[model samples]
Target: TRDRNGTWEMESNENFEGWMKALDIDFALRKIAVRLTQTLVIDQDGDNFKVKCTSTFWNYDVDFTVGVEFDEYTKSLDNRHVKALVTWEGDVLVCVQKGEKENRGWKKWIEGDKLYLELTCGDQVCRQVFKKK
Candidate 1:
């Protein structure tokens, strides 16, 4: 576990918007997504915490206690449902999402001053890099 502090900006994003587009996200949503800023906030209270993804158009919140399994609905992405669980792999917080698509889900980790994210669906995987601001 690590200190999940600070606000991060999307320094580089790939396959994210494209995946959304593939899922039939409207042009307006796509445009708004491209221009909008996203913030990831984590509130830690011992082993229980809430992770929030906030943007101008949408906000996603997830509350989990470590080692607990939960259901996640990716409403932004065609409302695809997944059973997800997050745990620690060394200092990295890893999440595995099981759903309809093969090899679907994402992972988050920090390297020095940068935050790294990988989003996968089917055979397409999008890699994004965020920098603390």
Candidate 2:
């Protein structure tokens, strides 16, 4: 399950609207962004992990090593800066996004041939599950 090198296409989503709203995403962009089929291209090798969020609307790419911290700039999501820390607890990939917002982070895991991605902002959390393709 830790083999994270693959193209995972979005299958379903939950509470994504509220998560976007927490990011202050304007209502104008909500319609398009909410329904887009998001795909994550993940490449993991030991501690280095690179992920690319592929979508027809926009693309977001980031790279970091496990147990390492880096700065993340949101281009399509919130358009804000965040200090990101990524780590692995068991088979799940967990991330902590520290910035103006508290308890903002995300997580990724594979379950039954599907990959689950949970996005968090403040108290709102969004789950976007994807299938390996």
Please list the residue runs of candidate 1 whose C-alpha ends up more than 4 Å from where it truly belongs after superposition.
21-28
Task: State the displacement of the C-alpha of residue 122, model 1, in Å, after optimal TM-score superposition.
Answer: 1.5
Per-model TM-score on C-alpha atoms? 0.81, 0.94
Looking at model 2, residue 37 earns an lDDT score of 81
State the lDDT of candidate 2 residue by residue for 13-131, as single tens digits. Answer: 99989998998988888888888888889998899988999889778899999998899998777888999999889998899999988778999988899888998988999998899
RMSD of 2: 1.1
lDDT of 1 by residue, 1-133 (tens): 3665667777788777766665556878777786566777778776687878788768878888777888988776558778988777887777777877666666788888988888776667777888887
Question: Lowest summed lDDT over 10 consecutive residues: which window, candidate 2?
Answer: 1-10
After TM-score superposition, the amount by which residue 133's alpha carbon in candidate 2 deviates from its true location, in angstroms, is: 0.6
Q: For model 1, what is the error of residue 105's alpha carbon versus the real structure, in angstroms, after optimal superposition?
A: 1.7
Backbone clash pairs for candidate 2 read none
Best by TM-score: 2
